[PDB]
Amino acid sequence: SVLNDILSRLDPPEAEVQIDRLITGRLQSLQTYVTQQLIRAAEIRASAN
Amino acid sequence: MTKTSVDCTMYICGDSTECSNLLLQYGSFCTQLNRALTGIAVEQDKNTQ
Amino acid sequence: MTKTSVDCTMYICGDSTECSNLLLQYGSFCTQLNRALTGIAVEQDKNTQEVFAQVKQIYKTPPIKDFGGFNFSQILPDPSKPSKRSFIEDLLFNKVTKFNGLTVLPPLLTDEMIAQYTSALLAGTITSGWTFGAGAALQIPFAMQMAYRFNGIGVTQNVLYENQKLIANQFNSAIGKIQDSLSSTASALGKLQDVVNQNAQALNTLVKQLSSNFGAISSVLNDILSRLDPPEAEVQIDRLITGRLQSLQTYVTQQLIRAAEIRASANLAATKMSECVLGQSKRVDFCGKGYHLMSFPQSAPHGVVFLHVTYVPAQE
Amino acid sequence: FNSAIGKIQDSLSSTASALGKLQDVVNQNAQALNTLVKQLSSNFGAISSVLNDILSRLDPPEAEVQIDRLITGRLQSLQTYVTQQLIRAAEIRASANLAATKMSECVLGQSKRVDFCGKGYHLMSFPQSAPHGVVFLHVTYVPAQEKNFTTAPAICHDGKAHFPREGVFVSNGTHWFVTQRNFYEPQIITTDNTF
Amino acid sequence: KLNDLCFTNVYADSFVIRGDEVRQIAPGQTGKIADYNYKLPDDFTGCVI
Amino acid sequence: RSSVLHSTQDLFLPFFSNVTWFHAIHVTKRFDNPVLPFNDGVYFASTEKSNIIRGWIFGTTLDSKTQSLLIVNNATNVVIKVCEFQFCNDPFLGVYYHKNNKSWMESEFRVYSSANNCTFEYVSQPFLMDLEGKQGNFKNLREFVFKNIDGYFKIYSKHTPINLVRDLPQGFSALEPLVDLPIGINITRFQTLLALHRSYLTPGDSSSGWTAGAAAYYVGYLQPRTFLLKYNENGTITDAVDCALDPLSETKCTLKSFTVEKGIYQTSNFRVQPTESIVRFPNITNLC
Amino acid sequence: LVKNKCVNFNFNGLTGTGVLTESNKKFLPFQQFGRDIADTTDAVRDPQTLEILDITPCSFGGVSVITPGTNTSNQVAVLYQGVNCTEVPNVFQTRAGCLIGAEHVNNSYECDIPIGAGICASYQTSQSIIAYTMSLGAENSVAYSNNSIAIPTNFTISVTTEILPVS
Ligand SMILES: *[C@@H]1O[C@H](CO)[C@@H](O[C@@H]2O[C@H](CO)[C@@H](O)[C@H](O)[C@H]2NC(C)=O)[C@H](O)[C@H]1NC(C)=O
Ligand SMILES: *[C@@H]1O[C@H](CO)[C@@H](O[C@@H]2O[C@H](CO)[C@@H](O)[C@H](O)[C@H]2NC(C)=O)[C@H](O)[C@H]1NC(C)=O
Ligand SMILES: *[C@@H]1O[C@H](CO)[C@@H](O)[C@H](O)[C@H]1NC(C)=O
Ligand SMILES: *[C@@H]1O[C@H](CO)[C@@H](O)[C@H](O)[C@H]1NC(C)=O
Ligand SMILES: *[C@@H]1O[C@H](CO)[C@@H](O)[C@H](O)[C@H]1NC(C)=O
Ligand SMILES: *[C@@H]1O[C@H](CO)[C@@H](O)[C@H](O)[C@H]1NC(C)=O
Ligand SMILES: *[C@@H]1O[C@H](CO)[C@@H](O)[C@H](O)[C@H]1NC(C)=O
């Protein structure tokens, strides 16, 4: 689960397959958070108004 | 609500250079997330005003 | 906001048949995104009807135009000019300013038609007061209507008739300033412009996503199809397809959230139209600043601009 | 009023247009939920949708790669349902919130705002429950027949102007009277009527 | 599909090695010859004969 | 499924498709049953009153070198044979009206030479036949659909009781499948058998002695299409609506309902398709 | 080379599909391709021809089927968003799109079905779908005078129903 650890342990030809999965997964976590914030922000905006 | 800004580069790829290049392939997802978040952060100031 | 449509299939798999079959495994994703946008497309048309079509009949102004010293020529429609739009409306329109499977459906209600609805409400308000919202319009002279509106805010009738010359000049003068102000800067029309920019940027961002590799050998779908084996395409195309669906998903999700804000704004507009344009709203600061005598509605590109007449006490 | 109530009862039975909004909400929820169940059958990138079939059919080292695609796709499908649901919830909440205001403004008390409640002036409202909804019957007063009358802003009786108090002047021509705007009644001018 | 596709910057390289050595001349591989004499790129896109 | 509408994409007869009538009726000197090319899924409809029509022969080339399938109908049982059979140019089924015994026996069952090997053999469920040579309108209508996919052979059939007009009837009835076959073999062409109604009036030879009577059958191909099928409470398919037969048909498929409410719906987005293909390359003729 | 007709073209290993038309842009001798704002190929120079030709995609947009109602009739009219009506294979050309199967009429009525861009189509009676420009309401002008007022002589109490979904 650590980029430093995966990068040291594996060489670049094969590092990328492992690093790709982490990046894809993390991107998903971010999008969910960002989407969640917008819905929450919209609720707050209505409340604010 | 508390204004939160997350750097897509720092959270995902991390400090590592290799992660940055792989992230670049995905596109403007890293950038688009920042735009959404600041806008939520900007919105919170407007509400208090 | 301008209707946007994206055939999911066209954007994700492209023209090629292979892209379509691979997308078929995903099932509902392609359709739901296409369907979700349609709901937003239809909803946008619905918003205008609610905000603008609050009058059963289209009223027309009298030829003589004696309104007890109020000059409404600028707000009202000019026959000589094309599209039946008021001078104020014309200024607003001027200030504001398929690529790749993306098509912008035209609005159900045309700009000329909307200008007419606004003209009708405005025409009705001058001639009939607030009575027209409730039932068939009943004509009351403007001075009497003005006097009656003053009574609602707590100032006696005598003040209006005695000071009618003075009150009329201020109204005419006030109208001049708004016109002068609108021409000088785009700050006044900032909110309307913001909606267009946000939608435009999202659309633009979506197009840029196609260029991105998403880990495929090459961004162009045709190049992969042309230079790779049929068995080899199971793997390369799949990364492209997965990425593109995510990009589409982000755009659709973002659009719904943006649509809600506009929907909320439209509801506020409907209330304002109902409460201010027709009738007088005793609520403080709902309409204008200070006691609110009356309101007039002027169409704007993708928006409603409200001119509010309010009474503020000058000296003590 | 009694007759008016009869028509609404008659109107609801004849057509589903009145209850269309409530019906729309149920179909969308049912449809969204149905789609999610339908998604299980779709296989994003694997030999077969059934997990059991994949397990029996393929080897353990190999099976993991295949299962991941099913998991990934299903997880995305579930997320889409949840994300879609929250936005729908938002629409209902805003709509739900409006009902509370209407209930407080209209049912509990008369509301001055024009068109907040019904069309025309709003005397009162009654609340009726519906499956997953609130239906309001609004009693409103709308003027029906009007006659053009000559009018003047003020009457100057003795060199001193007299203005109507809580009324608007109207005249046949022969005589001048003061009357309320909404309904027409004629009263001979008196000290009480004008100041 | 080589006949149908068209390309730029074509390069032709010839070298002779033992059959044990055949495996080494390929993308992302580790061999004495490959890591010390001739190493193909990770993203290399050409036929090996 | 019960009381639900399901859209299934698989080979089907396109609604209102071109139907090719084949005739073997003498009415003069008319008799025809030549070979017909078979595409993916070939639909066969047979209308027979005296059961002159009895058999179907399927093969890549019928060379007795590539496996071929023969279905022969017998009163006792439907016979399915898989075998490298060697067929003549002019196969048939022969029946004679003997004066001594009023019955119809086989005269020359030389449909094939022999069988080198048989990948598969089968006998279909028992059923019975009328075996009557009397003249008349076709009192019954029989339809079978043959399609071969993924190494299996599938036959679906239903029987229509009302003779009505000679041509196939307007009323719509779904068909259940009689059988499926394990045997998997390629197929490029097919042929249909006839019952020669040989009698005393005929010359009395295999080349000129024959008076068959009335026969009629239509052969139609199947192409992949999206079909919306309505299922009733019992589970039979009462009616079907085609996805792409007209603009109205597509709308029904999208809303998944037989009755479409007044409004505007969007389906089947159209993109123009290119008429010709052009390749432009450099004038260089050098051989690298 | 084929010009102004949609075609499949492979130019120097580049594959795309669009109508090809001669374009005025001045390619400086050095550059082979071209691109638009969103980085999509827009122009190319034929190697033999050595001319610059504009590229645009041929058609797009959904086909919308307008139905009066199944009970009322079995016939529908189709509107295509993109088609100019020369491109597509009773045709009426409107801003919303190309419409087939409807005869439009000058007289205007309220919009039963909305075809977009101010044109609406509704069934009329012998029977065919008709597309026409909508009229918002009957145009009536209230008389206004300095001394004229209208006051209602009678009133009607009416009950109106509003439906909202709480949960
Ligand atoms: C479902 O099928 C059954 C037959 O299996 C139908 O029930 C029939 O009901 C009537 C009542 O008098 C009688 O004909 C028999 O009791 C039943 N059938 C027969 C064939 O005799 C039932 O109605 C079917 N449901 C449908 C068509 O919706
Ligand atoms: C006010 O309007 C009411 C309602 O239309 C009128 O009441 C009707 O009068 C007619 C004629 O006298 C009767 O035949 C009906 O039975 C009454 N009821 C209704 C509902 O029509 C009334 O006459 C009108 N004018 C007034 C009171 O001046
Ligand atoms: C009203 O405004 C118009 C336009 O500025 C002007 O022509 C007209 O003279 C103004 N005043 C009056 C009293 O008509
Ligand atoms: C009222 O106003 C005008 C004259 O100003 C006239 O055309 C109309 O007939 C009158 N209507 C009524 C109902 O008295
Ligand atoms: C005006 O009102 C009075 C009411 O007493 C009536 O006598 C008179 O006839 C009316 N004038 C008309 C109808 O001209
Ligand atoms: C498309 O319609 C327009 C109408 O203004 C016309 O000018 C143009 O020539 C048409 N396009 C064709 C024929 O390609
Ligand atoms: C109203 O109209 C009459 C027309 O005779 C006119 O005399 C009068 O001045 C007008 N009233 C005003 C301007 O207040």
Side-chain angles (χ1 to χ4, degrees), chain A, chain B, chain C residues 1-97 99-186 188-316, chain D residues 1-13 16 18-195, chain E residues 1-17 19-49, chain F residues 1-165 167-288, chain G:
Chain A
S1 64
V2 179
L3 277 175
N4 290 7
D5 173 19
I6 170 51
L7 231 164
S8 64
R9 304 206 305 84
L10 264 179
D11 58 349
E14 300 190 339
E16 193 284 329
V17 275
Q18 254 50 10
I19 297 182
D20 182 16
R21 271 219 283 262
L22 267 165
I23 297 304
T24 303
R26 294 187 178 185
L27 256 172
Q28 288 303 350
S29 280
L30 256 189
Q31 270 186 12
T32 292
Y33 171 71
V34 169
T35 276
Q36 280 297 335
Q37 285 295 189
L38 269 66
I39 302 179
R40 271 185 188 85
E43 176 291 331
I44 274 303
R45 175 197 297 271
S47 190
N49 282 354
Chain B
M1 67 181 192
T2 59
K3 328 190 292 180
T4 301
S5 169
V6 186
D7 300 351
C8 47
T9 290
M10 186 66 296
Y11 179 62
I12 313 184
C13 223
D15 299 359
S16 165
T17 165
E18 288 184 355
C19 171
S20 72
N21 284 343
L22 275 290
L23 175 58
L24 167 57
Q25 278 188 354
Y26 281 80
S28 60
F29 272 166
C30 168
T31 280
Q32 182 173 18
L33 283 171
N34 276 2
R35 177 174 296 87
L37 273 198
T38 61
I40 288 179
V42 169
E43 192 64 2
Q44 306 334 326
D45 295 353
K46 175 61 160 56
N47 294 0
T48 292
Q49 193 60 7
Chain C
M1 52 171 174
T2 46
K3 315 197 199 172
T4 54
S5 299
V6 172
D7 184 6
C8 52
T9 298
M10 255 280 306
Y11 184 57
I12 293 182
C13 207
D15 54 356
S16 69
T17 50
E18 195 53 3
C19 177
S20 291
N21 290 201
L22 295 171
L23 201 59
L24 208 65
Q25 319 290 224
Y26 286 79
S28 60
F29 276 37
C30 183
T31 282
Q32 285 189 185
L33 293 182
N34 176 190
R35 168 155 70 209
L37 285 186
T38 288
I40 292 181
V42 159
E43 174 173 357
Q44 299 320 152
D45 180 5
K46 164 69 178 296
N47 292 3
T48 289
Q49 300 271 320
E50 191 175 357
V51 176
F52 284 102
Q54 285 185 347
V55 302
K56 52 178 175 301
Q57 298 169 338
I58 288 294
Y59 300 86
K60 188 173 67 169
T61 325
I64 304 304
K65 282 194 182 181
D66 300 1
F67 281 131
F70 289 78
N71 200 335
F72 285 150
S73 70
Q74 8 207 194
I75 52 182
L76 270 173
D78 293 358
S80 59
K81 298 301 195 65
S83 296
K84 307 182 179 297
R85 293 193 291 193
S86 303
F87 192 84
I88 277 180
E89 302 182 33
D90 298 6
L91 270 50
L92 294 184
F93 227 91
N94 291 356
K95 286 189 62 61
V96 173
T97 43
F99 195 85
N100 180 2
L102 319 164
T103 173
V104 166
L105 299 43
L108 163 43
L109 286 171
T110 63
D111 284 344
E112 185 291 331
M113 277 193 276
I114 277 175
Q116 277 213 4
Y117 265 140
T118 68
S119 77
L121 290 178
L122 193 171
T125 293
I126 308 178
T127 49
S128 172
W130 64 53
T131 64
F132 95 75
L138 319 171
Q139 75 270 12
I140 309 172
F142 209 61
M144 268 137 191
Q145 174 178 315
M146 211 46 58
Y148 223 74
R149 283 186 197 268
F150 263 39
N151 215 345
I153 92 180
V155 174
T156 38
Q157 297 192 15
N158 38 5
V159 176
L160 198 171
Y161 295 117
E162 296 190 342
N163 290 15
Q164 187 172 29
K165 283 309 200 180
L166 176 59
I167 290 183
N169 291 11
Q170 303 196 44
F171 189 133
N172 298 355
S173 180
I175 286 297
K177 276 180 182 296
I178 140 67
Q179 147 185 335
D180 291 2
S181 161
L182 284 189
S183 69
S184 179
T185 48
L189 283 174
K191 299 185 76 173
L192 301 181
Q193 201 178 183
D194 186 7
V195 154
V196 188
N197 268 11
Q198 285 181 344
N199 279 358
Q201 206 156 339
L203 254 284
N204 179 305
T205 277
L206 207 43
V207 177
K208 184 148 287 62
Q209 293 297 187
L210 302 189
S211 70
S212 298
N213 295 352
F214 282 81
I217 303 180
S218 69
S219 167
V220 30
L221 193 50
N222 273 257
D223 174 13
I224 305 297
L225 211 56
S226 61
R227 98 178 203 194
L228 262 177
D229 211 10
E232 177 55 324
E234 179 170 19
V235 51
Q236 295 317 249
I237 274 186
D238 212 16
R239 280 203 288 271
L240 266 166
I241 288 181
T242 292
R244 292 184 184 185
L245 269 180
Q246 295 303 178
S247 277
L248 242 181
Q249 261 284 351
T250 280
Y251 165 64
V252 176
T253 288
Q254 294 295 345
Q255 209 78 21
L256 288 169
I257 295 187
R258 277 183 205 274
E261 181 172 10
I262 283 304
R263 157 70 72 61
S265 188
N267 278 353
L268 180 49
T271 286
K272 269 188 183 65
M273 270 293 334
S274 180
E275 178 261 316
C276 276
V277 172
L278 318 172
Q280 210 185 35
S281 59
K282 293 187 175 178
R283 310 167 59 185
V284 193
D285 189 33
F286 181 73
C287 284
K289 186 176 154 45
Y291 312 112
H292 157 295
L293 285 185
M294 64 182 45
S295 292
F296 308 106
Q298 291 299 30
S299 62
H302 293 132
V304 185
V305 169
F306 276 111
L307 300 199
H308 285 143
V309 282
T310 65
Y311 167 122
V312 53
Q315 298 166 20
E316 4 57 344
Chain D
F1 186 119
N2 280 338
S3 181
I5 270 295
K7 284 177 181 180
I8 133 65
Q9 179 285 335
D10 182 4
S11 160
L12 284 185
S13 58
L19 277 179
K21 288 182 177 177
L22 295 184
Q23 191 65 5
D24 182 5
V25 154
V26 164
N27 287 5
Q28 288 182 359
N29 287 1
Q31 181 162 24
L33 187 43
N34 179 306
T35 278
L36 176 51
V37 174
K38 196 162 179 178
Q39 220 79 337
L40 282 192
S41 79
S42 173
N43 62 248
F44 296 28
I47 39 181
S48 181
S49 64
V50 187
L51 275 196
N52 298 359
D53 179 2
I54 301 328
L55 276 32
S56 179
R57 175 174 169 180
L58 230 37
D59 36 328
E62 164 56 343
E64 276 294 342
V65 179
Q66 226 64 135
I67 285 291
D68 202 301
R69 262 174 161 196
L70 262 57
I71 290 180
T72 294
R74 288 189 188 172
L75 194 300
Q76 283 298 356
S77 298
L78 206 170
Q79 185 180 340
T80 293
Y81 168 67
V82 161
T83 282
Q84 264 298 2
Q85 206 77 344
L86 288 180
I87 305 178
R88 266 198 211 94
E91 301 179 8
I92 289 301
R93 182 181 196 276
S95 185
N97 225 309
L98 171 54
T101 298
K102 260 180 182 170
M103 182 89 63
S104 300
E105 283 192 354
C106 278
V107 179
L108 297 191
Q110 177 169 346
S111 67
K112 298 307 185 186
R113 320 165 57 179
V114 191
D115 191 22
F116 176 74
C117 276
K119 287 300 306 194
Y121 314 104
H122 146 292
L123 300 189
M124 60 178 49
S125 298
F126 312 93
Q128 291 301 17
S129 74
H132 297 123
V134 64
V135 161
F136 286 104
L137 297 175
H138 299 264
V139 190
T140 49
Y141 167 44
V142 297
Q145 312 170 183
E146 74 293 351
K147 288 184 180 181
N148 306 0
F149 287 124
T150 62
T151 166
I155 292 282
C156 166
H157 167 244
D158 189 10
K160 312 188 302 308
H162 282 128
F163 294 54
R165 169 201 301 174
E166 95 97 4
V168 64
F169 285 180
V170 288
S171 58
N172 289 352
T174 306
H175 8 252
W176 269 91
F177 321 120
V178 24
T179 174
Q180 15 168 354
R181 282 228 169 132
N182 302 359
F183 195 75
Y184 171 59
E185 299 183 7
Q187 308 188 348
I188 307 301
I189 310 197
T190 32
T191 62
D192 43 348
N193 272 343
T194 45
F195 52 86
Chain E
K1 255 147 170 174
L2 267 169
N3 300 177
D4 302 352
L5 64 68
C6 218
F7 15 51
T8 325
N9 296 181
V10 193
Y11 271 48
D13 313 311
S14 299
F15 58 45
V16 179
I17 48 180
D20 181 0
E21 311 302 26
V22 45
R23 184 183 62 86
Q24 281 62 210
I25 297 282
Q29 306 299 193
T30 182
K32 181 56 59 58
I33 54 195
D35 306 328
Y36 284 73
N37 293 251
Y38 178 25
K39 162 91 161 299
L40 297 176
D42 49 356
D43 64 6
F44 171 58
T45 60
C47 306
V48 63
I49 264 63
Chain F
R1 318 159 161 89
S2 66
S3 299
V4 286
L5 303 72
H6 188 59
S7 80
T8 181
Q9 182 279 329
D10 48 300
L11 289 45
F12 274 126
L13 183 69
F15 274 90
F16 302 118
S17 185
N18 186 0
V19 71
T20 112
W21 208 332
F22 285 159
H23 281 107
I25 186 179
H26 181 270
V27 180
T28 48
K29 312 291 168 180
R30 182 155 165 85
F31 181 78
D32 200 44
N33 57 340
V35 80
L36 296 166
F38 145 109
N39 297 185
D40 300 0
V42 159
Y43 174 115
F44 189 112
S46 60
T47 163
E48 234 319 313
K49 189 290 179 182
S50 299
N51 308 178
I52 304 300
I53 290 61
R54 280 191 182 266
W56 305 216
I57 297 82
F58 292 55
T60 267
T61 59
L62 318 180
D63 54 0
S64 66
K65 315 185 282 176
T66 302
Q67 189 60 176
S68 307
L69 146 159
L70 152 72
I71 287 52
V72 185
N73 193 310
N74 186 328
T76 66
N77 55 180
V78 307
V79 168
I80 295 179
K81 300 168 61 56
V82 165
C83 296
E84 292 280 10
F85 277 125
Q86 185 49 80
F87 297 156
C88 181
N89 296 13
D90 294 326
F92 63 87
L93 199 144
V95 290
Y96 195 84
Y97 192 76
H98 297 269
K99 202 179 78 177
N100 60 296
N101 52 341
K102 289 173 184 180
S103 183
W104 297 90
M105 284 71 75
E106 180 68 22
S107 297
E108 179 65 274
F109 211 101
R110 204 180 64 187
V111 191
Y112 40 82
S113 311
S114 65
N116 162 213
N117 34 9
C118 299
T119 60
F120 189 88
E121 283 88 50
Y122 191 91
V123 168
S124 179
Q125 80 193 337
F127 57 91
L128 299 177
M129 296 183 66
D130 194 355
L131 300 176
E132 295 183 1
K134 279 56 64 182
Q135 299 301 358
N137 69 318
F138 301 140
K139 208 49 159 180
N140 277 339
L141 173 55
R142 308 191 175 192
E143 311 81 355
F144 313 76
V145 165
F146 310 70
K147 109 173 76 174
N148 165 21
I149 48 180
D150 71 53
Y152 284 71
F153 198 63
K154 310 190 187 184
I155 287 193
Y156 311 58
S157 180
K158 188 61 182 304
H159 290 242
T160 301
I162 66 301
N163 39 55
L164 269 275
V165 289
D167 39 330
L168 42 71
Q170 62 298 352
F172 147 97
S173 301
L175 66 209
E176 337 74 340
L178 295 183
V179 263
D180 292 316
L181 274 305
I183 265 92
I185 192 187
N186 333 61
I187 303 178
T188 299
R189 57 188 284 289
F190 86 97
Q191 196 159 335
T192 305
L193 285 43
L194 276 299
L196 291 177
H197 214 58
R198 192 176 288 107
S199 66
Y200 67 98
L201 291 154
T202 63
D205 60 291
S206 287
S207 196
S208 72
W210 59 272
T211 42
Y217 65 96
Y218 343 129
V219 171
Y221 294 37
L222 315 73
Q223 305 187 348
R225 278 205 195 308
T226 301
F227 262 67
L228 185 73
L229 297 186
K230 171 191 184 186
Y231 282 110
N232 60 344
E233 177 61 1
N234 293 152
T236 57
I237 296 193
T238 67
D239 202 2
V241 181
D242 189 311
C243 246
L245 163 58
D246 67 52
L248 182 43
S249 295
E250 268 181 353
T251 67
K252 291 183 183 181
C253 220
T254 283
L255 307 183
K256 302 282 185 296
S257 59
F258 268 51
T259 58
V260 195
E261 298 299 357
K262 175 174 70 174
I264 190 181
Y265 309 85
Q266 105 166 210
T267 55
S268 82
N269 326 8
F270 104 106
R271 83 189 189 275
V272 190
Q273 298 199 151
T275 57
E276 296 185 347
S277 178
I278 70 171
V279 172
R280 291 290 269 178
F281 271 150
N283 51 6
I284 299 302
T285 304
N286 315 14
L287 275 282
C288 293
Chain G
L1 196 55
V2 65
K3 299 182 187 180
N4 307 11
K5 178 184 324 318
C6 310
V7 268
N8 245 1
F9 78 142
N10 177 340
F11 277 32
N12 286 232
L14 159 166
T15 312
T17 316
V19 297
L20 298 180
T21 69
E22 300 198 15
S23 205
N24 71 354
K25 28 228 291 190
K26 304 300 180 180
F27 256 51
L28 295 188
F30 39 103
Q31 324 100 129
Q32 302 283 341
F33 297 166
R35 262 173 199 20
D36 69 355
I37 309 170
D39 209 73
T40 88
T41 303
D42 187 12
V44 314
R45 171 186 314 197
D46 198 9
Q48 305 152 21
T49 309
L50 210 160
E51 317 176 359
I52 299 302
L53 19 161
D54 189 1
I55 290 188
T56 307
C58 193
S59 279
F60 287 138
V63 183
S64 304
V65 183
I66 287 164
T67 164
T70 289
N71 180 355
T72 297
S73 167
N74 298 355
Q75 69 178 353
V76 297
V78 196
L79 153 160
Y80 310 74
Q81 334 272 10
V83 303
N84 192 0
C85 302
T86 156
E87 189 68 3
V88 326
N90 322 330
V91 308
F92 183 35
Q93 176 64 139
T94 74
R95 296 192 308 174
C98 160
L99 197 59
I100 71 180
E103 67 295 344
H104 89 139
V105 305
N106 301 324
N107 22 358
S108 316
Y109 324 63
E110 54 296 354
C111 298
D112 300 1
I113 318 179
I115 295 305
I119 288 299
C120 27
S122 61
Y123 216 47
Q124 191 266 339
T125 300
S126 297
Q127 319 208 50
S128 53
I129 292 62
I130 56 170
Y132 54 75
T133 320
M134 61 174 311
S135 65
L136 314 318
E139 178 162 28
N140 86 66
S141 187
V142 63
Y144 173 107
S145 297
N146 312 343
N147 68 359
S148 64
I149 194 183
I151 313 294
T153 58
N154 207 351
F155 70 76
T156 83
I157 302 303
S158 69
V159 180
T160 173
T161 311
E162 171 188 3
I163 304 298
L164 302 168
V166 171
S167 61

